[PDB]
Design an enzyme around this catalytic site. Sequence first.
Site, PDB file in Angstrom:
ATOM      1  N   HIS A 225       0.838  -1.192   0.000  1.00 24.66           N
ATOM      2  CA  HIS A 225       0.000   0.000   0.000  1.00 24.66           C
ATOM      3  C   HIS A 225       0.875   1.244   0.000  1.00 24.66           C
ATOM      4  CE1 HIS A 225      -0.330   1.413   4.445  1.00 24.66           C
ATOM      5  NE2 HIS A 225       0.795   0.733   4.294  1.00 24.66           N
TER       6      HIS A 225
ATOM      7  N   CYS B 248       3.792   5.415   5.636  1.00 20.28           N
ATOM      8  CA  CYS B 248       3.814   4.226   6.466  1.00 20.28           C
ATOM      9  C   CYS B 248       5.245   3.723   6.542  1.00 20.28           C
ATOM     10  CB  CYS B 248       2.892   3.147   5.884  1.00 20.28           C
ATOM     11  SG  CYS B 248       2.785   1.610   6.824  1.00 20.28           S
TER      12      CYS B 248
ATOM     13  N   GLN C  95      -7.407  -2.566   9.693  1.00 18.77           N
ATOM     14  CA  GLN C  95      -8.596  -1.714   9.763  1.00 18.77           C
ATOM     15  C   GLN C  95      -9.603  -2.137   8.700  1.00 18.77           C
ATOM     16  OE1 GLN C  95      -7.373   2.472  10.924  1.00 18.77           O
ATOM     17  NE2 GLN C  95      -5.642   1.984   9.583  1.00 18.77           N
TER      18      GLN C  95
ATOM     19  N   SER D 171      -5.981   5.848   9.634  1.00 17.22           N
ATOM     20  CA  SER D 171      -4.609   6.294   9.389  1.00 17.22           C
ATOM     21  C   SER D 171      -4.534   7.377   8.323  1.00 17.22           C
ATOM     22  CB  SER D 171      -3.690   5.138   8.961  1.00 17.22           C
ATOM     23  OG  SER D 171      -3.982   3.930   9.627  1.00 17.22           O
TER      24      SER D 171
ATOM     25  N   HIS E 238      -5.339   5.409   1.430  1.00 18.55           N
ATOM     26  CA  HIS E 238      -4.472   4.333   0.938  1.00 18.55           C
ATOM     27  C   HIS E 238      -4.735   4.061  -0.536  1.00 18.55           C
ATOM     28  CE1 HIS E 238      -3.932   2.869   5.223  1.00 18.55           C
ATOM     29  NE2 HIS E 238      -5.122   3.447   5.308  1.00 18.55           N
TER      30      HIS E 238
HETATM   31  C1  LIG Z   1      -3.154  -0.863   6.641  1.00 18.26           C
HETATM   32  N1  LIG Z   1      -2.861  -1.229   8.030  1.00 18.26           N
HETATM   33  C2  LIG Z   1      -1.566  -1.402   8.443  1.00 18.26           C
HETATM   34  C3  LIG Z   1      -1.274  -1.741   9.713  1.00 18.26           C
HETATM   35  C4  LIG Z   1      -2.323  -1.918  10.631  1.00 18.26           C
HETATM   36  C5  LIG Z   1      -3.604  -1.752  10.245  1.00 18.26           C
HETATM   37  C6  LIG Z   1      -3.935  -1.394   8.902  1.00 18.26           C
HETATM   38  O1  LIG Z   1      -5.087  -1.231   8.470  1.00 18.26           O
END
Ligand SMILES: Cn1ccccc1=O
Length: 147
Positions: A43, A97, A115, A138, A141
Amino acid sequence: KLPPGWEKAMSRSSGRVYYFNHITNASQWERPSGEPARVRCSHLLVKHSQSRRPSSWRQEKITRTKEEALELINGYIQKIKSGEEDFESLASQFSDCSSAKARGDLGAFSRGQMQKPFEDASFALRTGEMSGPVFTDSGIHIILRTE
Ligand SMILES: Cn1ccccc1=O
Ligand SMILES: Cn1ccccc1=O
């Protein structure tokens, strides 16, 4: 009719039909082709000021707005689709990330680990396909299913 999440849509500019997936936010002219315990995804994350943790290895304090983050995501998608840039190269350079250091690779995972919008998009992608903008706490993405 169509695989999970896909629906037909009408192009406003051209009037030609296209296909949109409301789980992955993918969209494409071509009619989609044709569940596993685990999938593997890479991602590219763009964080913003309302991110759960508004910090990354790129920026100690992330100040951009959600709208600005979406614009960046949109632009990365355009360059990946035109082939000016590769998904993995953009992820290494611009993903907020820690997985940027691994060309965005997160490894394999099961349902109930990520998530939920990320999980649902990842499992609705077919191997080799890429999502549109996927929203989580977060950030925003782009997801590439690799296995
Ligand atoms: C994309 N991602 C990455 C790490 C933890 C959760 C999550 O949704
Ligand atoms: C089948 N197909 C072909 C080209 C682009 C996307 C897609 O799903």
